[PDB]
C-alpha cells in the first residue's frame, strides 16, 4: 500500500507542477485521469 500511496503522492505532485507551469488543459486532463486511475487502486 505504501508503494501505491507513493505513486498517488507523486502523480498528485505531477499535476501540480504542470499547473504551475501553465501547461495546456488537455495535458492536465490526461494527468488527472492518471491520478484517478491510481486512486481507484488504493
Amino acid at each position, epitope marked *: 500500500r505504501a508503494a501505491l500511496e507513493e505513486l498517488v503522492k507523486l502523480q*498528485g505532485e505531477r499535476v*501540480r507542477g504542470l*499547473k504551475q507551469q*501553465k501547461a*495546456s*488543459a488537455e495535458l*492536465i*486532463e490526461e494527468e*488527472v485521469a492518471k*491520478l484517478l486511475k491510481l486512486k481507484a487502486q488504493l
Partner: antibody
Amino acid sequence: QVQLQQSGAELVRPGSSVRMSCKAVGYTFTDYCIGWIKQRPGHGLEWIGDICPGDAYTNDNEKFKDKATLTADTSSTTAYMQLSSLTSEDSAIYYCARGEEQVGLRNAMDYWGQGTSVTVSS
Amino acid sequence: DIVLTQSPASLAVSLGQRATISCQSQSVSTSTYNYMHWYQQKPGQPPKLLIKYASNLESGVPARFSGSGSGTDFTLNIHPVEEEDTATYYCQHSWEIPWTFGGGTKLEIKR
C-alpha cells in the same frame, strides 16, 4: 457547510494600501484553489488571481501584476489579498470564491464569499 | 487574452416563455470536456454558479436552467422563465490563464 467568510467594507485614501481577508471553512483548505474576483459597475466581473494554499503558489493575471498580491495562512485557513497604489478604479466589490481542486481538472467557482466593498476616496 | 462575447447584452422574456443566452469565443473545449461555465447574479448578491462544464447543473439549482454547446459556442437556457429569474447572467471559461468572464446578460421579466 462550506463557507467563505470575508472581511468588512473598507474606506481608504488614494495612493494607500489595503488588505482584506477570506476565511474558508467546511472543507480541506489545501485541496482547493481560491479565486479573487473584482466587480465594479460597468465592468461586470474580472478575475484577479488564484491562491493555491499548502505549498502555496498563485495563478496570476498580468493586468493585476503590481496591483494585487495573494497570500494564504494554512493554519487559520485564511486567504489574503492586498491592493496597493489605490486609485478610484480600484473602488469595487471583491469576492473570494473556492475554485478548482488543486489536483483535479480546471473548474468553475462554486462557493462564494459575500464580498468586500472597497471605497477609494479622499 | 481570451474574449467571451455574450448576446444579447439585455433581454426581456414573458412569464412561462424561454430565455436563450449565448456565449461565443475561441475553442475552450477538449475532446472530452467543455470548460465553459454559467453564473447568475442578482442585485445586492454575490454571483451564483448555475452550470459547470457547459451542461452540468449544480445541486440546488432548478431544472428550469440548462446549458449546452461545445468548442466555440455555448448557450444558457431558462424555461419556463419566472419572476425570480431577473438577474445578470455571466459565462466564464476555465481553459487557460487568465480566466475571463463574458460581458453579462441582463434578464428582465416581462409582464
